[PDB]
Design goal:
heterodimer; B: alpha/beta; Rossmann fold; eight-stranded mixed β-sheet
């Protein structure tokens, strides 16, 4: 689920 | 073949010097192979997937991607304007939740599923499995990654984003699968990419443009974005006849660019994913 966009 | 003005990630991989903006790949583009994306799911109806992406299993009330992460990775793996293997087959396994998280007990269930679901599909050129998820040891999760690998699937997993030794994080620490680290545009290890000796290869991971939910796209960073890059390459190379699922990750690291990265701790491999294409 690792990372960072609007999010994991 | 050559995609001009492409996302730097794709360019960096068909190049040997950074700063270039063209992706050179063989027309075969991964046709005939399969890539199971075990994430939050794929927005299968996104125009960029050209009806090649399909949901296959869920572990939550719904099957669609209501987060975006998964779709973003599925896009890098094999989507028309952003993927490595532009003509591959994408299967969606929703093991994560819409908030991005998910229980180990079910992450494991997801890996066991791809192991046998692969046996009813039609992928003559091999099967790849991208796992852009992780956590923080568990002899049980590593173990599941290994089983998945033993059955004949190229497992590519993320190293982690804690800027720490990957040995303390499970999917990553399993020696049998391919642990991907993240690199940035100036051939520098992303500030957040886990390192260590368990790492196998490095791929583009910072500021990566890709597909998103709602039929949109957007840039995001992480070893999450790097994993599908080599997953894509793995499939691409597999339909090309260059390597087998069991031995892919070794071939990718043998044929990678050596010593081009900076800010790589002593003890960590300095290899960047690379497809060796020549017109």
């Amino acid at each position: 689920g690792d990372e960072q966009g609007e999010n994991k | 073949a050559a995609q001009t003005n492409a996302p730097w990630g794709l360019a960096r991989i068909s190049s040997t010097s950074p700063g270039t903006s063209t992706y050179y790949y063989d027309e075969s583009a991964g046709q005939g192979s399969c890539v199971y994306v075990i994430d939050t799911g794929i927005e299968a109806s996104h125009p960029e997937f050209e009806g090649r992406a399909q949901m296959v299993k869920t572990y939550y009330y719904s099957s669609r991607d209501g987060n975006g992460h998964g779709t973003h990775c599925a896009g890098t793996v094999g989507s028309r304007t952003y993927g490595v293997a532009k003509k591959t087959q994408l299967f969606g396994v929703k093991v994560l939740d819409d908030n991005g998280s998910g229980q180990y007990s079910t992450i494991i269930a997801g890996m066991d599923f791809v192991a046998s679901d692969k046996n009813n599909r039609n992928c003559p050129k091999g099967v790849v499995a991208s796992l852009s998820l992780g956590g923080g040891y568990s002899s049980s999760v590593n173990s599941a990654a290994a089983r998945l690998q033993s059955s004949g699937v190229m497992v590519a997993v993320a190293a982690g984003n804690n800027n720490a030794d990957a040995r303390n994080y499970s999917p990553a620490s399993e020696p049998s699968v391919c642990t991907v680290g993240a690199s940035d545009r100036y051939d520098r290890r992303s500030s957040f990419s886990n390192y260590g000796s368990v790492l196998d290869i490095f791929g583009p991971g910072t500021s990566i443009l890709s597909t998103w939910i709602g039929g949109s796209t957007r840039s995001i960073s992480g070893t999450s974005m790097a994993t599908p890059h080599v997953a894509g390459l793995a499939a691409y190379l597999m339909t090309l006849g260059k390597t087998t699922a069991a031995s892919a990750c070794r071939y990718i690291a043998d044929t990678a660019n050596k010593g081009d990265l900076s800010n790589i701790p002593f003890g960590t491999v300095n290899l960047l994913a690379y497809n060796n294409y020549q017109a």
